[PDB]
């Protein structure tokens, strides 16, 4: 029985409204829930879904240099695999094995429909329409370390923008965009931006291209034999068109706009 | 001195206009020539840019079960690493090592302006306008192993159409689209499709969205010690935004069309 570590993140892994009457992996539904099922069938193994304790994805603490989240639960032999929207990064790659990305993404711009913004350069060229990110995370860090002119300017603006353009959560960012009457833009993951875009009141949308390129990947303990079989699974699921099917399923079929 | 095998596919790898007045790797230019320079810089090693002998990307022969193109040169010990627009595929993942994707792409359609086609389905619904792909390419491998209605049908057509709708090289396919008077559509990766569309004589065009989603990856023989190093360098060059830089530098459209 393979211990699968994941995290509650809609539409990846969520609990059904009636998860009370259900039990086991049946309580959950979502993109990663179906993917986990597909990976297990192509690899031939029984799995049990568990939610990462600290609700973190994976980061090494500067102080204790200890890994937390789903990445930590892997490097310390607590879980056999990680099936969630885990982004493939250098530091992470160094401590765990990553299969080829099962979904692409990148920092994108979320504006309230009607907002006269077309790209990142447009935002950096003005201030009448405030824009921000999470007051903590990779999105924020992305600008704090960007050598690109457009992004470097955006960082200077944001860090000195008044009132504060940083939000504490994704919910706050989305709500602020919906309440600012087109006077505020939020920078978040494309997958999450295009997901909200399919949710009523349907007043938001993604604009322009992503400011960068990332990709989620299934993770296994560095050196785990299970990693190879899972990688081929991903590639096969992608080639057969299944990954595009699961995407269209939880993002558009269940759409609302 | 690491031996790097690559293919002349512009804007990835091309021979400088005055290459005869040059020598060494300095003879070439392109996205992959730069990427290679960066990979070698970080991994710390000398290299030589060799061109794939049989001028193919890679494909296994059903009967002999022998690989050709770059995949072959890596499998049979002819090259230490492959730095070119090599598509990461299941069948290739099984015989060679791949680094995480350094660039994304998807099969697309190239046509001569005025061609009554604007989607893969349109082509699959007729025969007046012939269409094929590149030999020993991942695109041809796609349709052949595809079980997705439209694609499965397109494959059947292709291997039954007369004369042969297939071509030996990308240029051979592009030239056919321009000379066929619209009586031939070419299926090639969007990356190469969009580049050529912004170039003279400005007679080709990309229609409809891509048919799939994947990405090019750095390849090395299985077990190769370069694998890890190169992979981490790829993830770093991405996080540093170096990949996007090269992407914008070589795909920069100076409005010829
Ligand atoms: C599809 N999306 C959904 C949200 C999300 C969040 C995420 C979680 C909470 C929130 S919040 O509730 O609004 N908040 C700010 C508390 C916002 C974003 C964080 C991470 C992530 C994803 C995937 N993938 C990662 O690799 C990752 N690393 O995350 C890193 C930390 C940040 O870089 C890690 O956990 O190591
Ligand atoms: N990228 C393909 C070649 C181009 C194509 O098939 O259109 C490969 O690596 O085989």
From Swiss-Prot, chains A, B:
Post-translational modification (record): Palmitoylated. Depalmitoylated upon L-glutamate stimulation.
Residue spans, topological domain Extracellular: 116-257
Site (Interaction with the cone snail toxin Con-ikot-ikot): 60, 144, 236
Subcellular location, record wording: Cell membrane; Postsynaptic cell membrane; Postsynaptic density membrane
Disulfide bond sites: 202-257
Annotated L-glutamate binding sites: 85, 87, 92, 138-139, 189
Induction remarks: Down-regulated in the pyramidal cell layer of CA1 in the hippocampus by global ischemia.
Note: The postsynaptic actions of L-glutamate are mediated by a variety of receptors that are named according to their selective agonists. This receptor binds AMPA (quisqualate) > L-glutamate > kainate.
Free-text domain note: The M4 transmembrane segment mediates tetramerization and is required for cell surface expression.
Similarity-based family: Belongs to the glutamate-gated ion channel (TC 1.A.10.1) family. GRIA2 subfamily.
Full protein name: Glutamate receptor 2
Gene name for this UniProt entry: Gria2
Whole-protein coverage range: 415 to 794 of 883
């Amino acid at each position: 029985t393979v211990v699968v570590t994941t995290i509650l993140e809609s539409p990846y892994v969520m609990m059904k409204k009636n998860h009370e009457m259900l039990e086991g992996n049946e309580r959950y539904e979502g993109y990663c829930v179906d993917l986990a099922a597909e990976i297990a069938k192509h690899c031939g193994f029984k799995y049990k879904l568990t939610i990462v304790g600290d609700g973190k994805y994976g980061a090494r603490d500067a102080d204790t240099k200890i890994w937390n989240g789903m990445v930590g639960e892997l490097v310390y032999g607590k879980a056999d695999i990680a099936i969630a929207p885990l982004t493939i990064t250098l530091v992470r790659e160094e401590v765990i094995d990553f299969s080829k990305p099962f979904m692409s993404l990148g920092i994108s711009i979320m504006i309230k429909k009607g907002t006269p913004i077309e790209s990142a350069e447009d935002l950096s060229k003005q201030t009448e329409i405030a824009y921000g990110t999470l007051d903590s995370g990779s999105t924020k860090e992305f600008f704090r370390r960007s050598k690109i002119a457009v992004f470097d300017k955006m960082w200077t603006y944001m860090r000195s923008a008044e009132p504060s353009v940083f939000v504490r959560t994704t919910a706050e960012g989305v709500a602020r965009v919906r309440k600012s009457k087109g006077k505020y833009a939020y920078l978040l993951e494309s997958t999450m931006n295009e997901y909200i875009e399919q949710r009523k009141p349907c007043d938001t949308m993604k604009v322009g291209g992503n400011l960068d390129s990332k990709g989620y990947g299934i993770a296994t303990p560095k050196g785990s034999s299970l990693g190879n079989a899972v990688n081929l699974a991903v590639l096969k699921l992608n080639e057969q068109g299944l990954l595009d099917k699961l995407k269209n399923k939880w993002w558009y079929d269940k759409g609302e706009c």
